[PDB]
Amino acid sequence: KNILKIRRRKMNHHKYRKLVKRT
Amino acid sequence: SRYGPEYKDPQIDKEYYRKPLAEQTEEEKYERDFKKTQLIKAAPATKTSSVFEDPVISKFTNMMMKGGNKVLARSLMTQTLEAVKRKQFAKYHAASAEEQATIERNPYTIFHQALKNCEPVIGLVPILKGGHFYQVPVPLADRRRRFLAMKWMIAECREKKHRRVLMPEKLSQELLEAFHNQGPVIKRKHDMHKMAEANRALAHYRWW
Amino acid sequence: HRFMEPYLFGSRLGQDIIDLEQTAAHLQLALNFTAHVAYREGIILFVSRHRQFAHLIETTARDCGEYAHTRYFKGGLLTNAPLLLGPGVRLPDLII
Amino acid sequence: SSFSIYPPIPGQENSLRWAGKKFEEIPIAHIKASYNNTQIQVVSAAHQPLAHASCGTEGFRNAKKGTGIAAQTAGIAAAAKATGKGVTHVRVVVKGLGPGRLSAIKGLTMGGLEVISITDNTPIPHNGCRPRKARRL
Amino acid sequence: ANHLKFIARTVMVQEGNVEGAYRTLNRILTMDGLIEDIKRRRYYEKPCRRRQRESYETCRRIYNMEMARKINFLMRKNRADPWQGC
Amino acid sequence: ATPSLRGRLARLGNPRRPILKPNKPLILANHVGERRREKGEATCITEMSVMMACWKQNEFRDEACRKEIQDFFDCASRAEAARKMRSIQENLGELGSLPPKKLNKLLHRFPNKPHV
Amino acid sequence: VDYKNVQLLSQFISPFTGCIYGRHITGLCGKKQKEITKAIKRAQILGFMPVTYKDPAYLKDPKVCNIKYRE
RNA sequence: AGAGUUAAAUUAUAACUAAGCUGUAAAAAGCCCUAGUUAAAAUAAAAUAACCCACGAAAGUGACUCUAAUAAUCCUGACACACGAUAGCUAGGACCCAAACUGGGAUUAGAUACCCCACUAUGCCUAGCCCUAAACCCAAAUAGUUACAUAACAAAACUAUUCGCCAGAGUACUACUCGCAACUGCCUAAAACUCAAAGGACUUGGCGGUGCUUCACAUCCACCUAGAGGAGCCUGUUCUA
Numbered sequence: 001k002n003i004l005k006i007r008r009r010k011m012n013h014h015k016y017r018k019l020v021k022r023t
Numbered sequence: 024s025r026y027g028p029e030y031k032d033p034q035i036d037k038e039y040y041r042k043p044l045a046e047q048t049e050e051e052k053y054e055r056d057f058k059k060t061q062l063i064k065a066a067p068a069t070k071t072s073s074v075f076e077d078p079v080i081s082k083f084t085n086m087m088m089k090g091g092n093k094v095l096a097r098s099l100m101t102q103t104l105e106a107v108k109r110k111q112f113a114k115y116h117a118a119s120a121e122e123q124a125t126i127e128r129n130p131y132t133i134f135h136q137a138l139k140n141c142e143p144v145i146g147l148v149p150i151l152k153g154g155h156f157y158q159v160p161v162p163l164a165d166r167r168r169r170f171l172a173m174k175w176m177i178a179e180c181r182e183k184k185h186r187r188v189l190m191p192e193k194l195s196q197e198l199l200e201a202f203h204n205q206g207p208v209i210k211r212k213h214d215m216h217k218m219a220e221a222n223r224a225l226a227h228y229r230w231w
Numbered sequence: 232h233r234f235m236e237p238y239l240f241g242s243r244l245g246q247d248i249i250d251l252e253q254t255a256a257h258l259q260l261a262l263n264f265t266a267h268v269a270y271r272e273g274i275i276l277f278v279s280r281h282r283q284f285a286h287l288i289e290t291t292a293r294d295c296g297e298y299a300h301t302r303y304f305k306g307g308l309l310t311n312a313p314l315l316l317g318p319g320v321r322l323p324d325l326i327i
Numbered sequence: 328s329s330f331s332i333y334p335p336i337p338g339q340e341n342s343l344r345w346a347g348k349k350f351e352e353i354p355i356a357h358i359k360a361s362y363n364n365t366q367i368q369v370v371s372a373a374h375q376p377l378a379h380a381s382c383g384t385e386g387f388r389n390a391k392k393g394t395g396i397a398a399q400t401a402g403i404a405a406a407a408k409a410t411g412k413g414v415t416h417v418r419v420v421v422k423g424l425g426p427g428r429l430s431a432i433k434g435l436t437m438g439g440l441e442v443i444s445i446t447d448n449t450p451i452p453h454n455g456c457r458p459r460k461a462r463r464l
Numbered sequence: 465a466n467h468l469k470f471i472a473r474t475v476m477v478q479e480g481n482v483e484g485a486y487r488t489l490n491r492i493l494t495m496d497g498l499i500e501d502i503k504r505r506r507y508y509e510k511p512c513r514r515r516q517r518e519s520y521e522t523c524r525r526i527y528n529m530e531m532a533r534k535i536n537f538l539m540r541k542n543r544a545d546p547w548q549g550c
Numbered sequence: 551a552t553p554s555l556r557g558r559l560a561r562l563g564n565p566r567r568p569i570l571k572p573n574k575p576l577i578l579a580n581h582v583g584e585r586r587r588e589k590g591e592a593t594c595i596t597e598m599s600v601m602m603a604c605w606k607q608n609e610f611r612d613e614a615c616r617k618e619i620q621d622f623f624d625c626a627s628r629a630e631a632a633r634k635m636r637s638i639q640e641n642l643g644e645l646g647s648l649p650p651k652k653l654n655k656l657l658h659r660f661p662n663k664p665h666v
Numbered sequence: 667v668d669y670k671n672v673q674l675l676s677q678f679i680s681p682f683t684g685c686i687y688g689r690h691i692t693g694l695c696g697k698k699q700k701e702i703t704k705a706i707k708r709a710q711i712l713g714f715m716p717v718t719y720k721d722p723a724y725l726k727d728p729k730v731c732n733i734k735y736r737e
Numbered sequence: 738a739g740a741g742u743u744a745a746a747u748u749a750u751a752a753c754u755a756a757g758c759u760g761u762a763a764a765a766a767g768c769c770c771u772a773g774u775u776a777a778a779a780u781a782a783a784a785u786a787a788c789c790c791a792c793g794a795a796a797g798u799g800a801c802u803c804u805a806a807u808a809a810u811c812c813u814g815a816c817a818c819a820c821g822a823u824a825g826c827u828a829g830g831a832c833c834c835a836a837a838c839u840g841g842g843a844u845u846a847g848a849u850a851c852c853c854c855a856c857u858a859u860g861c862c863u864a865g866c867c868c869u870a871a872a873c874c875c876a877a878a879u880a881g882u883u884a885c886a887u888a889a890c891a892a893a894a895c896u897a898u899u900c901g902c903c904a905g906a907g908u909a910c911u912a913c914u915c916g917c918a919a920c921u922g923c924c925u926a927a928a929a930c931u932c933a934a935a936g937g938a939c940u941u942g943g944c945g946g947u948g949c950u951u952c953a954c955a956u957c958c959a960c961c962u963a964g965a966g967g968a969g970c971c972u973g974u975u976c977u978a
């Protein structure tokens with residue numbers, strides 16, 4: 001329900017961390 | 024089911040109706056039977072008041088029957104009984120006084136003893152657990168064990184004979200072999216008991 | 232019940248004692264009204280759902296020449312009169 | 328008839344004998360009942376091992392030996408090997424909570440052996456070592 | 465371990481009937497929660513899971529207690545009714 | 551006695567921190583639950599194992615042991631009679647308590663009031 | 667309540683286990699349930715009273731607790 | 738916060754005894770320097786009480802003993818000052834047991850997962866960092882009222898004094914800045930551009946490899962009988978023609 005927002009942020013952060021690792 | 028649930032099954036026994044005066048609870052019982060204005064199913068064509076008919080012989084007869092033939096199956100039953108009789112007379116007159124006291128010439132008591140010897144004690148049911156099918160030992164009801172006995176008899180004496188050999192011959196052979204416990208039918212019952220012991224732990228899977 | 236407090240004389244050891252001065256003052260006016268209604272020829276209905284005094288009340292109303300509903304009250308009885316009771320009807324001018 | 332559930336303390340004068348022996352002199356049957364297996368060992372009161380029987384010793388295998396039937400079989404086998412060394416009575420000590428608890432006990436009874444007291448000593452930490460993690464994360 | 469053996473969690477069999485003795489024992493252990501605790505300690509339960517379990521159990525107990533109380537309070541009125549077909 | 555409800559739940563007035571977090575509100579319902587049917591387990595397993603030991607010893611001749619076979623049969627008959635006759639009496643008699651239906655009717659006669 | 671007297675204390679202990687009974691069993695004011703508990707723990711570690719069972723000597727003392735094991 | 742202590746486990750380690758032990762829905766792998774019983778330090782963790790509701794500002798705190806000790810004659814208040822779960826970092830010490838990682842074993846179409854075994858960082862102690870949590874009781878602090886009064890749901894509705902915050906959704910716990918023992922960090926926090934919605938509660942359905950009851954009467958399983966699927970033909974489809 002509200003989890004949809006949390007899911008967006010979750011994904012963003014994950015992606016970003018992965019990115020920092022690569023870069 | 025052309026009979027409503029109102030219809031009771033008939034009691035064909037003559038001895039029950041002939042000698043009523045010595046029993047109170049049964050007098051009261053069949054008093055309540057007829058006086059209830061209870062409808063009775065018409066007595067079957069197979070069943071008679073005959074003093075000569077064995078319900079077990081009749082069941083085995085039915086179980087032999089292929090198609091609609093009561094005639095041919097009653098024929099093969101009659102012939103098998105006669106064949107057991109004469110086989111035991113041939114065994115009787117070639118023997119000595121001791122073995123003439125021992126040997127049984129009644130094809131009826133040989134039938135009943137062969138089937139009592141051939142009936143299994145315990146059985147196997149498949150049970151699904153964790154996506155696998157395990158064969159589990161199950162205690163059996165009486166009727167199931169009688170059935171299994173008869174069906175095993177007819178199965179073997181249908182299947183394993185040479186095509187030249189007639190049915191009453193093979194059946195009398197196996198009746199007399201299962202009387203003495205040495206027949207392949209009792210070997211089947213033993214395969215069942217050994218497969219029931221091999222799996223005995225799995226008896227916990229049974230929830231009833 | 233919260234609205235009952237102005238009618239209470241007080242509470243004696245956990246039991247609530249109704250002030251009977253006010254009870255008399257009220258019952259006076261109630262009986263006054265009820266009689267005036269019966270005088271002007273109008274329908275009085277005795278309603279109670281309690282099963283002890285059901286019979287007693289039905290008896291009472293029969294003996295006043297008045298009507299009594301002591302039974303299960305059917306849902307649309309007063310609101311939808313014409314369907315439950317009939318094509319056109321008169322409704323009780325007072326209910327007790 | 329006055330019967331106490333509680334056992335006979337050693338320093339007490341209490342007189343009860345099973346084949347003439349004090350409660351303390353009776354051999355002890357240790358039954359370790361664990362979810363995958365049941366082990367039984369009958370021992371002297373002096374802690375000298377008399378008899379050992381397990382569900383593995385009894386010729387079962389992996390899953391099978393968990394069951395109560397196997398526990399009973401091991402109990403019978405144990406009671407046989409023990410009566411062979413001539414123990415009439417025994418005090419049962421049950422260690423563990425599993426499928427083979429009661430089965431192994433009455434399998435000792437069935438194996439021609441007499442049980443007098445039945446004790447439960449199951450490890451119960453008052454919080455020692457942290458146990459392994461829960462299944463199905 | 466350092467305590468004296470055989471004094472605790474021990475039941476003496478009466479008249480040779482073992483099943484009843486074991487039953488008495490199991491009832492004892494269940495009474496003191498020892499069984500639930502043996503079972504719960506097979507796997508570690510993380511402190512928050514524990515906290516949750518305790519809170520739920522207490523709520524459950526409150527509800528059950530209160531329901532049983534209204535039951536026994538109301539039990540009198542299960543008698544055959546006086547006013548039938550009134 | 552009932553465990554105290556004072557200061558347990560999270561409320562605007564309450565000084566301290568929650569003890570109980572109720573999943574669903576604590577209010578007495580006007581009905582009870584339906585009794586949970588007992589989980590069945592295997593029956594006659596003991597007499598079976600006895601009989602199977604008998605067989606393994608005597609080489610599966612039935613004539614050898616007539617006692618264990620007969621007692622396993624007897625036990626299975628008592629298990630059938632159990633299954634049939636216990637269903638009805640367990641479904642009716644609750645002993646000291648009442649069947650859930652009568653309990654529910656009773657409760658509906660004296661309902662919980664959340665409202666007003 | 668004194669840690670030194672093991673009798674009064676072991677009244678509130680389960681004979682078979684050595685557990686401490688709760689309020690619903692002993693039936694005490696919170697104050698005294700607390701007191702009994704703290705006392706029991708102290709007496710247990712100071713070496714006055716055994717932890718894993720009730721001391722046999724005190725078995726036949728008056729039973730004040732509401733629990734019934736044997737039925 | 739110090740210092741001292743240990744009941745229940747558990748283990749090094751022997752002594753007997755047994756060939757297996759462990760492990761799952763089921764097995765395999767692992768181990769037989771194994772297992773059961775009898776002995777036992779260290780380490781770590783603190784059954785029951787607790788159906789209690791205390792202490793602390795919060796984080797937190799529930800084995801025992803003692804020492805020290807819980808600001809303000811009590812309004813609000815920062816970016817200043819001092820703290821701050823778990824994880825993590827540096828250095829030294831500990832290591833029972835647990836366990837990211839990793840390696841084996843199963844599972845599976847695959848299985849870099851769920852399940853099994855082994856073992857590590859790590860959890861512990863000392864000292865120093867790091868300063869984040871769904872750090873949420875998603876309900877600010879201090880005084881009050883139960884008057885007016887139900888969006889919905891939830892923990893009923895409100896006054897007064899304050900401080901902190903909030904101006905559609907994404908982009909974004911992002912880029913660029915300042916500061917910071919942090920250098921894959923924290924903090925502070927945009928815009929281009931994209932969209933016409935994004936959201937919160939509910940209603941009735943449908944569905945659920947969700948739970949509890951009750952069933953299936955040729956009907957699911959258990960079970961009975963005869964057939965089909967293999968042969969030849971008959972006849973119909975599909976292709977190819």
Ligand SMILES: [Mg+2]
Nearest residue numbers: 008009011012
């Ligand atoms: Mg995104």
Ligand SMILES: [Mg+2]
Nearest residue numbers: 462463464510
């Ligand atoms: Mg998770």
Ligand SMILES: [Mg+2]
Nearest residue numbers: 565566567793
């Ligand atoms: Mg506080």
Ligand SMILES: [Mg+2]
Nearest residue numbers: 571572573574
């Ligand atoms: Mg909720």
Ligand SMILES: [Mg+2]
Nearest residue numbers: 738739862863
């Ligand atoms: Mg320190």
Ligand SMILES: [Mg+2]
Nearest residue numbers: 465466745746
């Ligand atoms: Mg120790």
Ligand SMILES: [Mg+2]
Nearest residue numbers: 749779780832
């Ligand atoms: Mg060491």
Ligand SMILES: [Mg+2]
Nearest residue numbers: 765766767768
């Ligand atoms: Mg292997």
Ligand SMILES: [Mg+2]
Nearest residue numbers: 453454783800
């Ligand atoms: Mg402790």
Ligand SMILES: [Mg+2]
Nearest residue numbers: 807808809811
């Ligand atoms: Mg202060």
Ligand SMILES: [Mg+2]
Nearest residue numbers: 812813814878
């Ligand atoms: Mg201030």
Ligand SMILES: [Mg+2]
Nearest residue numbers: 821822867868
């Ligand atoms: Mg920190």
Ligand SMILES: [Mg+2]
Nearest residue numbers: 827828829830
């Ligand atoms: Mg280090």
Ligand SMILES: [Mg+2]
Nearest residue numbers: 832857858859
């Ligand atoms: Mg390590």
Ligand SMILES: [Mg+2]
Nearest residue numbers: 459835836855
């Ligand atoms: Mg491990």
Ligand SMILES: [Mg+2]
Nearest residue numbers: 840841842849
């Ligand atoms: Mg792997």
